[PDB]
Design a protein around this ligand. Structure first.
Ligand SMILES: CC(C)(COP(=O)(O)OP(=O)(O)OC[C@H]1O[C@@H](n2cnc3c(N)ncnc32)[C@H](O)[C@@H]1OP(=O)(O)O)[C@@H](O)C(=O)NCCC(=O)NCCS
Ligand SMILES: CC(C)(COP(=O)(O)OP(=O)(O)OC[C@H]1O[C@@H](n2cnc3c(N)ncnc32)[C@H](O)[C@@H]1OP(=O)(O)O)[C@@H](O)C(=O)NCCC(=O)NCCS
Lengths: 405, 395
């Protein structure tokens, strides 16, 4: 345990700066001890998505574009997605279902209170699994690329959960698809540098912020709409787990963010009067794959560990940005076909939930490992990596150590 | 691959020993000077609201009460003529504001960063973390990415983008920097706070008088700091140790200060009771930050040095009165409010810079006005208070 009340960890009686620092910092590695997930109620099957999307956006007359989009939908390897809207809800907003009519205000009115609400649902489940009082949460890391406001989404989530007035909040806005890795990076330093600290990480996304009508000259926008789904993932992270009360699963050993040079125009999103405008180059799977190995070598060398000769020796939580990203990263690292199974299962059942996807995969991995009676939460293996990929191109590389079952 | 018993050894080697310390401060502002005495004339002319005589009389009075002498902006009257939508009240303007703020904020921030890194004296290759802060403009990839790119930092610098945290954000960056520097051996954190207020500029309205109050206060500016634990003797210049950092939300006060990003840009809302909410709850935040580190709060608040966010003259007046402080205690804050206005997240950095510069010039015992302990305070939307406990070092 943290030993907050122990003599060895007590604060100095005199105003000793270094003595305060020694008492204030935690001892061990930041550890994931609970994972909760949530999604909105409306089920959108991928086999009928081309029909639903083209009908809802008054685009069924674009016959050749529909056939092209139906092909893309089959190639996504997504079976279903969840949204906070149905066809009836979209009829109230003809501006959102158009291509470029003014729509930010309406999207903000939905996303500003909606994202913290969805995130709170995942947080309640994470707090329940953890089992300790919500008043003992000292840090809140909220993450979303859907909606911005002052006071921010972290404030709203804290209010809905009824967290202490003195909770240290962090609002990670618009960090896209790498954000699920960014939250682990934040949580690591926050938990490790503060004795007794328990960090609640919340990643929540409502993709209606980027929904619009398909366009022939902006084909990449429709491709993004075939991938993005709504969802929320929440995690409780803390150093020095209390034996018999908390359940330590994954230790966050090293966390580094890397930018791939000369690739700013590969994945970029802009918040305009028409909402979030998405742009994607055909070169994203190959750009990520050609640079992922260098990111892994960096994360291992930064902690003095010799990079494994075989990448199959590790467990993996890669962000399912697209099926081709998963396929090409797998091929470059010479990984066996089942190494990314947890990621492919989540992509199938939930789609690309932006920052929430990796939390869902980490949940799937630990649940399947326990269900099969494996040795550790990380597929029976000791070391692994969580990867976030997004705008920049930016790669978040999170080195994890799994504890035994 | 190492064993289960080796994970703690990795953690021991990875963490820093001492307290996060401010070792360099750099500041920057755009070139266009707008004196406060003539602001009523300039603002009402640029927004074509010269027919609203009764509202101009009220605005001129507010400008005289602000205790701001001048402000700096990235625009002049000629620049504003190219954007009639920004100078109106509710015409669509977000796209144009984003086109200015998205590349402009990291550009201004980089200018301040260059000055901070130059003072620090070590190679830019030694910067391991970047904390960028702004309430003006949002984009993917974010302002942190753009700043790192402009400075030409390493590809693997850990970046933190603090978007839309308002006037308390200058305190938030110190809170972030503390944990980043202290939990990582050899880590050097570059903190950058930059704001371009054109994101909230609009025409005055009688039904929205609180927006006019905001336009009389906000000015453009940037502040940058280098923060790190375990200062290198003879190379680095350690100034302020970040001992304790706490964020507090004052309950039932969400409607006091709130801003919304709409199709018309940033819409500002302010209740007339903001100085009261801040002043009546500030002492409790101070007792809390001292108790958190086991230090008995001083019986006299004049025993500490102060870096309060100059949200407005009345906020400074009421906090001064509640803490029973002598007029010279907020000297650094009042000089910055006068010379630069309210630069949002950048203001506290400017005050900390002014404090250490004047302390060095007067030959005082420490960088914190010759005193040992002090507090940096951020106040903003929520109402949220960022309380940063600092221990200053000798010259
Ligand atoms: C979208 C995806 C699932 C389609 O699978 P696929 O195996 O590449 O399918 P196909 O090769 O049959 O191609 C489908 C059509 O889309 C095109 N396409 C794919 N990505 C495209 C993009 N970003 N922009 C424009 N066209 C694109 C191909 O050019 C092709 O059509 P064409 O023959 O008319 O030239 C796959 O490309 C992918 O996973 N991309 C990564 C997506 C991503 O980047 N996600 C993260 C961004 S936040
Ligand atoms: C704006 C300020 C400098 C004016 O100084 P002041 O000493 O209070 O001036 P006065 O009392 O003479 O008042 C000026 C007029 O503005 C009014 N006023 C002040 N703040 C107001 C607000 N937020 N909304 C509407 N009216 C406001 C008074 O009601 C008064 O007019 P009245 O006679 O019609 O009733 C001062 O109120 C202040 O510093 N407020 C805090 C500013 C702030 O909130 N900053 C944070 C922005 S996030």
């Amino acid at each position: 345990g943290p030993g907050m009340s122990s003599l060895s960890n007590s604060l100095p009686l005199m105003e000793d700066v270094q003595g305060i620092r020694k008492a204030q910092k935690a001892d061990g590695t930041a550890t994931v001890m609970a994972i909760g997930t949530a999604h909105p109620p409306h089920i959108f099957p991928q086999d009928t998505y081309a029909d639903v999307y083209f009908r809802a956006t008054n685009s069924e007359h674009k016959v050749e574009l529909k056939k092209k989009f139906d092909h893309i939908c089959k190639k996504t390897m997504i079976g279903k997605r969840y949204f906070n809207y149905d066809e009836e809800f979209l009829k109230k907003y003809p501006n959102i279902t158009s291509y470029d009519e003014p729509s930010l205000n309406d999207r903000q009115d939905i996303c500003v209170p909606g994202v913290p609400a969805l995130g709170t649902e995942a947080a309640v489940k994470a707090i329940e699994e953890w089992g300790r009082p919500k008043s003992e949460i000292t840090h809140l890391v909220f993450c979303t690329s859907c909606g911005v406001d002052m006071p921010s989404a972290d404030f709203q989530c804290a209010k809905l959960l009824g967290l202490h007035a003195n909770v240290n909040k962090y609002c990670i806005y618009m960090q896209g698809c790498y954000a699920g890795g960014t939250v682990m990076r934040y949580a690591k330093d926050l938990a490790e540098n503060n004795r007794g600290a328990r960090v609640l990480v919340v990643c929540a996304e409502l993709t209606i912020m980027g929904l619009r009508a398909p366009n022939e000259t902006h084909l990449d926008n429709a491709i993004g709409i075939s991938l993005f789904g709504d969802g929320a993932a929440a995690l409780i992270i803390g150093s020095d787990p209390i034996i018999g009360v908390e359940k330590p699963m994954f230790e966050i050993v090293c966390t580094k963010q890397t930018v791939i040079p000369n690739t700013e125009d590969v994945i970029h999103l802009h918040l305009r009067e028409t909402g979030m405008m998405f742009y994607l180059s055909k070169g994203s799977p190959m750009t990520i794959s050609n640079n992922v190995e260098a990111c892994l070598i960096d994360v291992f060398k930064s902690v003095g560990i010799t990079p494994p000769e075989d990448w199959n020796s590790l467990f993996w939580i890669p962000h399912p940005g697209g099926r081709a990203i998963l396929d090409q990263v797998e091929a470059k690292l010479k990984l066996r076909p089942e190494k990314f199974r947890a990621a492919r299962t989540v992509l199938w059942d939930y789609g690309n939930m932006v920052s929430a996807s990796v939390g869902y995969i980490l949940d799937e991995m630990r649940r399947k490992s326990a269900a099969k009676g494996l040795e550790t939460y990380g597929e029976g293996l000791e070391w692994g990596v969580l990867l976030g990929f997004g705008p920049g191109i930016t790669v978040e590389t999170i080195l994890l150590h799994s504890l035994p079952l």
